[PDB]
């Protein structure tokens, strides 16, 4: 029931060779739906549930406001450069925008900004003011309280952001609700008297997965080293979990995969072997 929306914006000085300087990427519950490029200058849909449920006039309106941010963030890249008294090099302006719909039905809007991998300004909804993190973020706060920015963002994050997020869940009900079964393969390696066992899971949806090693039907937490949930080119996910064991003890070790697609956790062995 937890639904999320994120608008990742990045303004770069060194892209570097043959790469865009400004990019705007949109997300719905983790899945990518919209993308923008500095050389293409057009916001285009990624998934089929968004393109079939929206008009061309919607995307033309979205690309017009995103290209406006491109020119605005280009100015911020030069304005902040003079504030820190820098000439130019490797400087980046990051932007976080969107809202969260909790299980109970509570609004959670956020508007954050960062310079060179460090937090610059964050918007506070319970105080109706912009929070400054660095002493160089003070002239930013002064510009925000001079005009109208705080009132407009509350009317946007609590209403405009939520109203459309509710439609995206309805549009992509079949896509986000769908579950994919991973292809599990149990492997092994020999180095210097150490039998290193590996467990690889290929192409699963959704992102949350619990992969753990089992010796004699007992969970060995501490011992197993994980690589992390890494994504694939087609939107699906992959994971790699490895463990160190004694040579000639490969058969008594088994990989346990816990996923939403499976009704019960699957136990996989090397000699079994894997799938199916």
């Amino acid at each position: 029931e937890l639904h999320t929306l994120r608008y990742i914006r990045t303004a770069m000085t060194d892209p570097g060779p043959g790469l865009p300087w400004f990019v705007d990427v949109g997300y719905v519950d983790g899945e990518l739906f919209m993308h923008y490029n500095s050389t293409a200058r057009r916001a285009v849909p990624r998934t089929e549930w968004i393109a079939a449920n929206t008009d061309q006039q919607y995307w033309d309106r979205e690309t017009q406001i995103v290209q406006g941010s491109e020119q605005i963030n280009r100015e911020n890249l030069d304005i902040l450069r003079r504030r820190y008294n820098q000439t130019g090099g490797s400087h980046t302006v990051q932007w976080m925008s969107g809202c969260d719909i909790l299980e109970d039905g509570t609004i959670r809007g956020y508007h954050q900004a960062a310079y060179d991998g460090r937090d610059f300004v964050a918007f506070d909804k319970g105080t109706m003011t912009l929070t400054a993190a660095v002493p160089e973020a003070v002239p930013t706060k002064r510009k925000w309280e001079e005009g109208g920015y705080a009132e407009g963002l509350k009317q946007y994050l609590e209403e405009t952001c939520v109203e459309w997020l509710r439609r995206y869940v309805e549009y992509g009900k079949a896509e986000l609700g769908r579950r994919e079964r991973p292809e599990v393969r149990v492997w092994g390696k020999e180095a210097d008297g150490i039998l290193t066992l590996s467990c690889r899971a290929h192409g699963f949806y959704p992102r949350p997965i619990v992969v753990s090693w089992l010796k004699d039907g007992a969970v060995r937490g501490q011992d197993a080293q994980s690589g992390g949930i890494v994504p694939n080119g087609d939107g699906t996910y992959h994971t790699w979990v490895t463990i160190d064991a004694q040579p000639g003890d490969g058969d008594k070790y088994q990989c346990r995969v816990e996923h939403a697609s499976l009704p019960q956790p699957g136990l996989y062995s090397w000699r079994s072997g894997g799938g199916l």
Binding site: Y7, I72, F120, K143, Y149, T160, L165
Partner: peptide, 10 residues
């Protein structure tokens, strides 16, 4: 579903 590109002004 974004709004005012003016909120990006620093």
């Amino acid at each position: 579903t974004a709004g005012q590109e003016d909120y990006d002004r620093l």
